[PDB]
Design a protein around this motif. Structure first.
Motif, mmCIF file in Angstrom:
data_model
loop_
_atom_site.group_PDB
_atom_site.id
_atom_site.type_symbol
_atom_site.label_atom_id
_atom_site.label_comp_id
_atom_site.label_asym_id
_atom_site.label_seq_id
_atom_site.Cartn_x
_atom_site.Cartn_y
_atom_site.Cartn_z
ATOM 1 N N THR A 1 -8.071 3.315 -3.105
ATOM 2 C CA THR A 1 -8.253 3.518 -1.726
ATOM 3 C C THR A 1 -8.292 2.239 -0.844
ATOM 4 O O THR A 1 -9.419 1.815 -1.149
ATOM 5 C CB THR A 1 -8.691 4.638 -1.014
ATOM 6 O OG1 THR A 1 -8.379 5.846 -1.784
ATOM 7 C CG2 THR A 1 -8.403 4.846 0.411
ATOM 8 N N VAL A 2 -7.191 1.592 -0.277
ATOM 9 C CA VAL A 2 -7.544 0.350 0.611
ATOM 10 C C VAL A 2 -8.393 0.989 1.894
ATOM 11 O O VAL A 2 -8.163 2.118 2.282
ATOM 12 C CB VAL A 2 -6.177 0.026 0.609
ATOM 13 C CG1 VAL A 2 -6.192 -1.287 1.987
ATOM 14 C CG2 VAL A 2 -5.582 -0.796 -0.402
ATOM 15 N N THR B 1 -4.015 5.512 -3.686
ATOM 16 C CA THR B 1 -5.173 6.321 -3.695
ATOM 17 C C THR B 1 -4.935 7.254 -5.049
ATOM 18 O O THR B 1 -5.949 7.665 -5.634
ATOM 19 C CB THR B 1 -5.239 7.392 -2.610
ATOM 20 O OG1 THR B 1 -5.689 6.626 -1.335
ATOM 21 C CG2 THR B 1 -6.582 8.283 -2.903
ATOM 22 N N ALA B 2 -3.622 7.628 -5.337
ATOM 23 C CA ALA B 2 -3.466 8.901 -6.029
ATOM 24 C C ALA B 2 -3.476 8.313 -7.521
ATOM 25 O O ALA B 2 -3.629 7.309 -8.019
ATOM 26 C CB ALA B 2 -1.998 9.532 -5.800
ATOM 27 N N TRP C 1 5.465 13.765 -3.116
ATOM 28 C CA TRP C 1 5.945 14.922 -4.164
ATOM 29 C C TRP C 1 4.904 14.857 -5.431
ATOM 30 O O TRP C 1 4.942 15.704 -6.242
ATOM 31 C CB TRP C 1 7.031 14.490 -4.758
ATOM 32 C CG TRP C 1 8.133 14.300 -3.632
ATOM 33 C CD1 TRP C 1 8.981 13.569 -2.685
ATOM 34 C CD2 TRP C 1 8.488 15.596 -2.606
ATOM 35 N NE1 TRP C 1 9.525 13.954 -1.820
ATOM 36 C CE2 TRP C 1 9.465 15.367 -1.802
ATOM 37 C CE3 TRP C 1 8.278 17.074 -2.989
ATOM 38 C CZ2 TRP C 1 10.014 16.203 -1.051
ATOM 39 C CZ3 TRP C 1 8.785 17.885 -1.955
ATOM 40 C CH2 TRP C 1 9.924 17.438 -1.021
ATOM 41 N N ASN D 1 17.234 11.753 7.095
ATOM 42 C CA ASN D 1 17.173 11.736 5.556
ATOM 43 C C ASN D 1 16.294 10.612 5.219
ATOM 44 O O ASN D 1 16.633 9.455 5.636
ATOM 45 C CB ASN D 1 18.394 11.618 4.959
ATOM 46 C CG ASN D 1 18.358 11.534 3.179
ATOM 47 O OD1 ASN D 1 17.215 11.352 2.845
ATOM 48 N ND2 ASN D 1 19.575 11.602 2.796
ATOM 49 N N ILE E 1 -7.643 2.930 8.217
ATOM 50 C CA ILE E 1 -7.783 1.764 7.780
ATOM 51 C C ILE E 1 -8.158 0.700 8.768
ATOM 52 O O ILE E 1 -7.405 0.565 9.686
ATOM 53 C CB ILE E 1 -6.480 1.121 6.923
ATOM 54 C CG1 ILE E 1 -6.121 2.022 5.992
ATOM 55 C CG2 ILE E 1 -6.914 -0.323 6.496
ATOM 56 C CD1 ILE E 1 -4.775 1.841 5.389
ATOM 57 N N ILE F 1 -1.253 -0.916 -4.277
ATOM 58 C CA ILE F 1 -2.414 -0.047 -4.506
ATOM 59 C C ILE F 1 -2.262 1.372 -3.953
ATOM 60 O O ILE F 1 -1.763 1.734 -2.697
ATOM 61 C CB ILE F 1 -3.747 -0.507 -3.747
ATOM 62 C CG1 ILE F 1 -3.732 -2.049 -3.989
ATOM 63 C CG2 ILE F 1 -4.857 0.075 -4.185
ATOM 64 C CD1 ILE F 1 -4.178 -2.539 -5.682
ATOM 65 N N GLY G 1 3.012 5.832 4.295
ATOM 66 C CA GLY G 1 3.738 7.208 4.454
ATOM 67 C C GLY G 1 3.733 7.757 5.991
ATOM 68 O O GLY G 1 3.260 7.135 6.905
ATOM 69 N N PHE H 1 8.098 6.996 -2.471
ATOM 70 C CA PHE H 1 9.453 6.517 -2.502
ATOM 71 C C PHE H 1 9.576 5.044 -1.875
ATOM 72 O O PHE H 1 10.006 3.906 -2.690
ATOM 73 C CB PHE H 1 10.178 7.400 -1.628
ATOM 74 C CG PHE H 1 10.911 8.408 -2.532
ATOM 75 C CD1 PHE H 1 11.855 8.166 -3.793
ATOM 76 C CD2 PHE H 1 10.573 9.763 -2.055
ATOM 77 C CE1 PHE H 1 12.219 9.246 -4.546
ATOM 78 C CE2 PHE H 1 11.180 10.836 -2.735
ATOM 79 C CZ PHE H 1 11.908 10.364 -3.993
ATOM 80 N N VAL I 1 0.817 -1.239 -0.108
ATOM 81 C CA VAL I 1 -0.044 0.014 -0.249
ATOM 82 C C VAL I 1 0.927 1.238 0.050
ATOM 83 O O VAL I 1 1.854 1.303 1.041
ATOM 84 C CB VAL I 1 -0.879 0.086 1.187
ATOM 85 C CG1 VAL I 1 -1.989 1.021 1.146
ATOM 86 C CG2 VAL I 1 -1.741 -1.168 1.450
ATOM 87 N N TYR J 1 19.025 13.565 -1.033
ATOM 88 C CA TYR J 1 17.661 13.191 -1.111
ATOM 89 C C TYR J 1 17.400 12.525 -2.221
ATOM 90 O O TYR J 1 16.773 12.673 -3.202
ATOM 91 C CB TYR J 1 16.949 14.411 -0.847
ATOM 92 C CG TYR J 1 15.520 13.848 -0.660
ATOM 93 C CD1 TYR J 1 15.183 13.358 0.767
ATOM 94 C CD2 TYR J 1 14.553 13.953 -1.713
ATOM 95 C CE1 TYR J 1 13.541 13.101 0.812
ATOM 96 C CE2 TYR J 1 13.141 13.611 -1.421
ATOM 97 C CZ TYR J 1 12.645 13.040 -0.148
ATOM 98 O OH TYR J 1 11.451 12.776 0.022
#
Ligand SMILES: Cc1cc2nc3c(=O)[nH]c(=O)nc-3n(C[C@H](O)[C@H](O)[C@H](O)COP(=O)(O)OP(=O)(O)OC[C@H]3O[C@@H](n4cnc5c(N)ncnc54)[C@H](O)[C@@H]3O)c2cc1C
Ligand SMILES: NC(=O)c1ccc[n+]([C@@H]2O[C@H](COP(=O)([O-])OP(=O)(O)OC[C@H]3O[C@@H](n4cnc5c(N)ncnc54)[C@H](OP(=O)(O)O)[C@@H]3O)[C@@H](O)[C@H]2O)c1
Length: 531
Positions: free
Chosen positions: A107-108, A36-37, A44, A434, A388, A34, A140, A15, A11, A61
């Protein structure tokens, strides 16, 4: 359209998810993602607000798992802009054909372990149902926008925006009366950009955050060519550090030096710019008196930046140690406050009472606005998982187990929930680093672990409850050796009202934390139950 059974579901397509997808293929595993976007990139992809820029430098980075990607890619500025970074992500994803392994617009919603078969069955808002031996949560650290605790928000007549769910097609503030709530990194970045287009700008600040100059510059394309010749090595060094970067570790103590030395030493940081100041001295995050000395110096810099001392004093951070809220890099921010059209509304004297359709009402006046930008942050660390319905052994909900704060072994997994891994989240170094170094280790460590279970034909990996608690007690033990849990920040949960005030993040140093994960994996995953 997503496969019906799979070795591992991932999910998140930023990155973390992308790299997990890359690596699981390499290791001969069926893997699918999977997101959402609409497309790859994660933060980003979501954070398109103008001004959006990374605070760890470009050369640092970035991914280091591919010698190809290091050699080919050309960074242009000391700190990549958000578009620069999104192209980078699009480049890497193209290079390895990653989308084929990803569902978008999806979206899960719920995930539920099944003791019978030792598998996760996982549902979505499109009605997909997917069964898997492992579930990687790469969704994330800063992914669910948070909004301020204010009535009348749905009444505002003008245009309403959050910086983390910003339009894909640029916005026009020309000649508008514009207001910004929030002066964290986001609010500090996006504000000088709007200041340039708006007729009048109102900056609604509550607690002032500490910010220092970025000092951006073009990258010397010859320095980038020398570096590329020893890139792998440069990176390997950044892995061998507390913070994941080349930041010098000041050997001395903020207390032991003279006032004159402290100034000259901090002045060379102020001129160079960036966040390396955080480690000017060994004990800035360990000693109230040490911190205070560093904090004051920064405070004076601020006062000298603004002409109107009255307005200057309103920007000075007060009441919390330097560094214990995330440190912000500024470009022409404090300088912005010198312009006729920029107004600083201090919500500490004058708290916001409500949003009116005309604008914002504080205790002293009302402000009228054509657009309101919310730079009010995120449901940090736990927020995206929390949306979730995650259920594990005994039908135990993830949400409730963790209501007193995140409970994990190495941040990587939790007792009662076998086969479930969190990429770069609570209980680990995560954002105190980082994040790319944080994200690679974890993707590697988890993925190695999945590879290990399949080779040895096992099917069930769970955190031993005693070790989990031992760990959690360890994370809070070290947290309390520092100054971190003494300040309301998103690290604590203090921006989501009702959330338990506990420091969510490991503070030992990336370096130190990673050799623990190594020994663990080395002794056949000590502190896990494998069957
Ligand atoms: C504006 C901003 C700038 C940043 N600046 C820095 C910086 O200076 N240096 C640094 O080291 N780090 C920075 N960070 C931290 C950042 O989290 C990491 O750098 C990194 O990009 C995280 O990547 P990720 O893959 O772990 O998660 P993300 O990039 O956050 O990706 C998570 C993805 O999961 C998706 N998702 C979540 N839940 C679900 C679900 N229900 N179903 C389907 N999809 C889901 C989201 O849409 C998102 O695309 C920044 C963060 C923000 C918000
Ligand atoms: N340049 C970069 O590298 C960059 C850019 C953006 C984000 N990030 C990452 O993501 C984190 C998020 O930064 P962020 O600025 O988006 O979120 P943030 O750091 O949580 O900022 C929250 C801001 O909104 C304010 N706020 C929240 N709720 C409020 C309310 N109810 N009323 C009034 N003000 C309110 C906070 O004031 P209070 O302090 O008083 O809570 C603060 O000013 C950053 O620290 C960093 O980790 C990095």
């Amino acid at each position: 359209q997503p496969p019906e059974e799979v070795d591992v579901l991932v999910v998140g397509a930023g990155f973390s998810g992308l790299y997990a997808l890359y690596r699981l293929r390499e290791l001969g595993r069926s893997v699918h993602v999977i997101e959402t976007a609409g497309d790859v990139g994660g933060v980003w992809y979501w954070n398109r607000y103008p001004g959006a820029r990374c605070d760890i430098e470009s050369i640092e980075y970035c991914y280091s798992f591919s010698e190809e990607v290091l050699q080919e890619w050309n960074w242009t500025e000391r700190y990549a802009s958000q578009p620069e970074i999104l192209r980078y992500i699009n480049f890497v994803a193209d290079k390895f054909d990653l989308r084929s392994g990803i569902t978008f617009h999806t979206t899960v919603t719920a995930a539920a372990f099944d003791e019978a078969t030792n598998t996760w069955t996982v549902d979505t808002n499109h009605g997909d149902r997917i069964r898997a031996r492992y579930l990687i949560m790469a969704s994330g650290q800063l992914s669910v926008p948070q909004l301020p605790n204010f009535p009348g928000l749905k009444d505002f007549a003008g245009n309403l925006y959050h910086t983390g769910n910003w339009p894909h097609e640029p916005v026009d503030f020309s000649g508008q009366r514009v207001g910004v709530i929030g002066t964290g990194s986001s609010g500090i970045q996006v504000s000088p950009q709007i200041a340039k287009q708006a007729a009048e700008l109102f900056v609604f600040q509550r607690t002032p955050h500490f910010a220092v100059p970025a000092r951006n510059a073009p990258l010397d394309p010859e320095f980038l060519a020398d570096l590329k010749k020893r890139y792998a090595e440069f990176r390997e060094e950044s892995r061998n550090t507390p913070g994941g970067t080349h930041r010098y570790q000041g050997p001395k103590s903020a207390l032991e030096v003279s006032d004159e030395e402290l100034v000259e030493t901090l002045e060379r940081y102020w001129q160079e710019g960036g966040p390396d100041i955080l480690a000017a001295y060994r004990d800035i995050l360990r000693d109230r008196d040490a911190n205070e000395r560093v904090a004051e110096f920064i405070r004076n810099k601020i006062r000298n930046t603004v002409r109107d001392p009255e307005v200057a004093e309103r920007l000075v951070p007060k009441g919390y140690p330097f560094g214990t809220k995330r440190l912000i890099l500024e470009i022409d921010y404090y300088e912005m406050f010198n312009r006729d059209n920029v107004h600083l509304v201090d919500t500490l004297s004058a708290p916001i009472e409500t949003i009116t359709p005309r604008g914002v009402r504080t205790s002293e006046r009302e402000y009228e606005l054509d657009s309101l930008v919310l730079a009010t942050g995120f449901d940090a660390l736990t927020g995206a998982l929390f949306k979730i319905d995650i259920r594990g052994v005994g039908n135990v909900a993830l949400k409730e187990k963790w209501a007193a704060g995140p409970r994990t072994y190495l941040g990587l997994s939790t007792a009662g929930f076998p086969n479930l891994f969190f990429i770069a989240g609570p209980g680990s170094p995560s954002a105190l680093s980082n994040m790319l170094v944080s994200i690679e280790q974890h993707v590697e460590w988890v993925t190695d672990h999945i590879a290990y279970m399949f080779k040895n034909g096992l099917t069930r990996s769970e955190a031993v409850l005693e070790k989990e608690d031992e760990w959690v007690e360890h994370v809070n033990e070290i947290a309390d050796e520092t100054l971190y849990p003494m300040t309301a920040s998103w690290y604590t949960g203090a921006n989501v009202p009702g959330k338990p005030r506990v420091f969510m993040l490991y503070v030992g140093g990336f370096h130190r934390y990673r050799q623990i994960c190594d020994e663990v994996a080395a002794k056949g995953y000590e502190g896990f139950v494998l069957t």
